[PDB]
Every structure is written in structure tokens, then in C-alpha cells.
Design a protein around this ligand. Structure first.
Ligand SMILES: [Zn+2]
Length: 558
């Protein structure tokens, strides 16, 4: 008839941090458009030059040169609308001069919304960016048809359905010339805001600790999984992604040996190294052949079937029991131990504390890495399993690959004694309704043996000559820890071309793990740091010492 109804898409929701600070907003602004025909018709000579000079005088950030250029490309006889020129001017920079532009009948000003992340680089891998709607995203969500913004990475991607909101509907009456005569009904679109667990103040501190370095970091509550901070480094500025990437922006994204475009936390995987010993050590204790105080002698190596497996301490550790084999990170103890225990036992135990398995985290496309096993080797390599492999695997090396997020889940679970799933989603504070919003993983015996593991972890950080004693032994929170190291085996012929000869050294220095938890007495937090190549101006332990010191300054242990 002449009753017609249109659909109104809502303003995409805002994203805040645990204490309310705004991480993704819709900046309000205006587009300036020019009346047509000012270069196509001889009558109006010099007309666009005039109204632009008044404009340039009003906002000098605008360049009258290029602006009249984009104009005459759109000024045509075939088109009779207004010719959009300025895409976006901030509301606050315009609303003084409003009435003068509105009442000017050569400039037409319309409101526009620009997605803006006020913290730029900070948290770029969690938050994410938005982008133009997808050809198959229109098949899935009809609200992106009307919007053309959809989440393309991060929370934005993961929680896109919640951030879209429901649409709104407006009914009106037309007539015989098709005109807005009477509005009939009108249900408005609604949108929701979400609050993450991160704290932007702590997120910032990580970024400046890591400034110049690379790697990953996670601060996570051990009781419920709430990620209080988490970074991949280096991070990128999000805002240039809403507007669109440049030809030049793509290069420095693809030819950069620090890989800032990649979420190392859950898309980067690395050899766990010595930090699996807590878990490998847990697999030992149910043998009757190994006990908390069984000793193996480390002469800096052992020999097996003609091949030599070294300890990292060429001059040998001596006799050690499990506690001190962890404390000093003796490889040789786990070599001997693993031989006793067998690979099946280590693998089974290692998979339950969360290796080679998604941590369950609410970011898109979490990688699982590689937890090696006889079954695994057989499909991936068409080769049987050799005691050599048990040995490499026992001390977190070989083909063993883990993501920083997995380490943190694992650390946390050792400290809690039970399941710990990491999450960023604190609450959904949808306008006029903030809505917010179990499998055992240790055996009954394995839980009885966990105090031994935790005492070893304490030693690593407070007893003289623990691999982390230098830095963690004088904190105002008693910390437990375990160190790890992953060496790099190869250096691609390309990556060499992308750097200069002097820096080759750095790019082959082994990686640094330090996972920790505090307070040893009543565990609350996990701090997992991974410095790519041991860092350029930070060190693993010093970073963790400072990350704990900042958390005390912010009362997160009060
Ligand atoms: Zn040793």
C-alpha cells in the first residue's frame, strides 16, 4: 500500500576494561558534501574555489588542494546528488560552527560514526579491529547487511554477534509522490556493551616493559580464569585498520622479523622446554620405582644406545632428587626418570594438564600446538617411536610445541589443583541490563603429590641457586616459578635477507620462558612471560619481577 517499514541497524557496542575504561568507541563526527555542477557548468565559475577557502580557513587540517580534486572527478551531469568531500570531521571540532554550515545551502553536513580505539597499540591482539562486511558474513548475520562494519579480529571478531545488537524497525506512511507523510510504529534497534577482564593500566605497563622486545605475557586469576592482562608483542595500532590498510602498510606487515601482526599468545607456539618438568615430574611419581626422594646422578650427560643426551650444565649437577632436579632444571633426572616411566605415561599425564589442546579461551582460532606421542609420530612422520624421543620429550624439547596461553593454563592448574579456563569476557553490560556470566583434571593420587611439585616451584624462586632466585626471592609477594628455554634450529634464507648481518646473532638466540604464580601460600595469579630470543633490553626474570611489582602497586594483592 502506502504503509512501508524500514530496518535500522544499531550503533555497534562499546568495549571497556575491568574498571570501566573505554577500549572501543564510536567517535561521532560529520561528513561535508558540496552542491553539484560547480565545475561542469560555465555559469558557476570560481564557485567551489570560494566556499572551500572559507572551509580551509575554518579547519586548516583540511587541504583545499586535494579536496577540490576528488570533487571534479565526481562532478558529472549523470549525477545530481551532493558530492561528498570530507569523510569525517570530529563533532567537537564542528559543533561551534554548526548553524553556519547547516544554514549554508552549498554545504550539506550529515552525521557519521567512526570506530575508534582510544588506546591505539595497547591490547591490539585482544580487542581487535573492525572491517568491511564479508560476502559470507551477509549470509550469516543480516545486521551486517545494514551496517557493513563487522568484527574482523580479536574480541571484535569473537563476540561479533553480541556487538552487532538486534536491529530496529520503523513504520511510516508514504503517498502518491512517495513522501514521508506520517510515521506509524517504531521499535528501536538495541546494542550491547561488553567489559573485558583486562586492566588497561596493567596492559600499558606490559607494553612499555616489552617496548623494543618481542614475545608474550599473561596475567591470569587462578580461581576463575579471568585474564587481568595479556599481550603479544610488539603490538600494532588498531585505528588504521578501520580506515583501511595502505600498500605500504602491507609491506611492513609482511617483511618484519618481529611479526607484530600475529597473536603470539594463542597463534604462536614454541617448545615448552624445562617448564614441563612439573608435569613430567607428576607423571613419574605413580611408579613405585620413582618417589619424591629417589635420586639420579647427573654427570652432565647420560649415554643411551650409543648416543649422548646432555644436561645444560656441562659440569654436571650431581645427585639430585625430583625437588632439586626441578629447582636446578636438571635435564638428566628426567632422562633417567622418563626411561623408567615410558612415553605413554608422560604423554597421558601431559595432555590432561592441557598440552596439545585448546585452552578454551574466547579469542578466535586458538592453536593447539604439538604434544608428542607414539600415535602422533606414526601419522605425522610414518616412523616408530625411539627412546631418544621419550628423552627429548621428557625435558620439553624435540617436537613438543606449546602456546603461551597453554603454559598459563598449565601453571594455573598446578597452583589451583583443578581446572582453570582462561577468559576475557567479564560482563555484558547491554543498555538497561548488565547480564555478566566441571571436569576434574588431576587423579586422586596425582593431587596428593602436587605439594611436592609446588615446593620445588618455590625453590626455583626463593632457595639459593634456583634458576629464578636472583629476581623473585625479594618480592613483597612470595612467588613460585619454573624457567624454560627453547632454542631455534634454523634460520630461513628469506628471514636472513630481511635483516642485516649484524643482527643475525640475535635472531638465533634461544627463547626464554618464565611462568610463575603468587602468592605461594594462597595462590591467586599466574604470570607467564615469553621473551623472544631472551629479549634485547629486558630479561625474563626482571620482566616478571616488575610485572609483580606493578600488581602490588595497584593493590591486586590487597
Ligand atoms: Zn643436570
Amino acid at each position: 500500500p502506502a504503509i512501508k517499514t524500514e530496518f535500522l541497524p544499531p550503533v555497534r557496542g562499546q568495549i571497556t576494561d575491568r574498571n570501566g575504561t573505554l577500549l572501543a568507541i564510536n567517535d561521532l563526527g560529520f561528513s561535508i558534501s558540496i552542491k553539484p555542477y560547480l565545475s561542469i557548468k560555465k555559469s558557476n565559475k570560481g564557485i567551489l574555489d570560494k566556499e572551500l577557502s572559507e572551509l580551509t580557513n575554518l579547519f586548516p587540517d583540511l587541504n583545499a588542494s586535494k579536496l577540490a580534486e576528488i570533487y571534479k572527478r565526481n562532478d558529472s551531469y549523470y549525477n545530481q546528488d551532493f558530492i561528498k568531500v570530507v569523510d569525517f570531521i570530529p563533532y567537537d571540532e564542528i559543533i561551534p560552527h554548526y548553524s553556519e554550515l547547516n544554514l549554508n545551502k552549498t554545504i550539506k553536513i550529515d552525521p557519521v560514526v567512526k570506530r575508534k580505539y582510544p588506546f591505539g597499540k595497547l591490547a591490539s591482539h585482544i580487542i581487535g579491529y573492525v572491517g568491511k562486511a564479508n560476502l559470507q558474513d551477509v549470509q550469516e548475520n543480516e545486521i551486517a547487511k545494514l551496517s557493513n562494519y563487522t568484527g574482523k579480529s580479536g574480541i571484535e571478531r569473537y563476540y561479533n554477534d553480541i556487538l552487532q545488537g538486534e536491529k530496529g524497525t520503523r513504520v511510516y506512511k508514504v503517498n502518491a509522490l512517495n513522501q514521508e507523510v506520517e510515521q506509524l510504529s517504531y521499535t528501536p534497534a538495541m546494542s550491547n556493551d561488553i567489559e573485558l577482564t583486562i586492566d588497561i593500566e596493567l596492559q600499558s605497563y606490559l607494553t612499555s616493559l616489552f617496548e623494543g622486545n618481542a614475545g608474550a605475557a599473561i596475567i591470569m586469576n587462578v580461581n576463575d580464569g579471568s585474564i587481568l592482562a595479556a599481550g603479544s608483542f610488539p603490538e600494532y595500532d588498531l585505528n588504521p585498520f578501520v580506515t583501511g590498510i595502505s600498500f605500504k602498510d602491507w609491506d611492513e606487515l609482511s617483511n618484519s622479523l618481529d611479526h607484530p601482526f600475529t597473536n603470539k599468545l594463542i597463534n604462536g607456539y614454541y617448545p615448552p622446554g624445562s617448564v614441563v618438568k612439573m608435569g613430567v615430574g607428576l607423571s613419574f611419581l605413580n611408579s613405585k620405582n620413582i618417589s619424591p626422594s629417589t635420586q639420579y646422578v647427573c654427570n652432565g650427560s647420560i649415554e643411551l644406545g650409543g648416543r649422548f643426551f646432555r644436561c645444560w650444565n656441562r659440569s654436571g649437577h650431581g645427585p639430585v632428587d625430583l625437588k632439586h632436579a626441578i629447582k636446578y632444571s636438571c635435564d638428566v633426572y628426567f632422562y633417567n626418570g622418563s626411561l623408567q616411566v615410558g612415553i605413554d605415561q608422560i604423554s597421558e599425564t601431559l595432555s590432561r594438564i592441557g598440552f596439545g589442546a585448546k585452552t578454551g579461551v574466547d579469542l578466535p582460532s586458538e592453536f593447539v600446538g604439538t604434544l608428542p606421542s607414539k600415535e602422533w609420530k606414526m601419522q605425522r612422520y610414518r616412523q616408530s617411536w625411539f627412546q631418544g624421543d621419550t628423552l627429548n620429550t621428557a625435558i620439553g624439547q624435540g617436537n613438543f610445541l606449546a602456546t603461551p596461553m597453554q603454559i598459563a593454563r598449565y601453571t594455573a592448574q598446578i597452583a589451583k589443583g583443578g581446572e582453570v579456563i582462561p577468559h576475557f569476557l567479564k560482563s555484558i553490560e547491554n543498555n538497561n541490563t548488565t547480564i555478566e556470566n566441571k571436569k576434574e583434571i588431576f587423579t586422586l593420587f596425582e593431587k596428593s603429590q602436587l605439594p611436592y611439585i609446588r615446593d620445588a616451584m618455590y625453590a626455583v624462586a626463593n632457595e639459593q641457586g634456583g634458576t629464578s632466585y636472583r629476581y623473585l626471592h625479594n618480592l613483597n609477594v612470595k612467588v613460585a616459578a619454573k624457567t624454560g628455554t627453547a632454542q631455534v634450529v634454523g634460520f630461513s634464507q628469506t628471514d636472513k635477507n630481511r635483516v642485516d648481518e649484524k643482527q643475525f646473532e640475535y635472531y638465533t638466540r634461544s627463547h626464554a620462558w618464565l611462568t610463575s604464580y603468587a602468592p605461594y601460600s594462597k595462590p591467586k595469579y599466574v604470570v607467564t612471560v615469553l621473551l623472544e630470543h631472551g629479549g634485547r633490553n629486558i630479561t625474563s626474570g626482571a620482566t616478571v619481577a616488575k610485572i609483580y611489582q606493578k600488581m602490588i602497586e595497584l593493590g591486586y594483592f590487597k
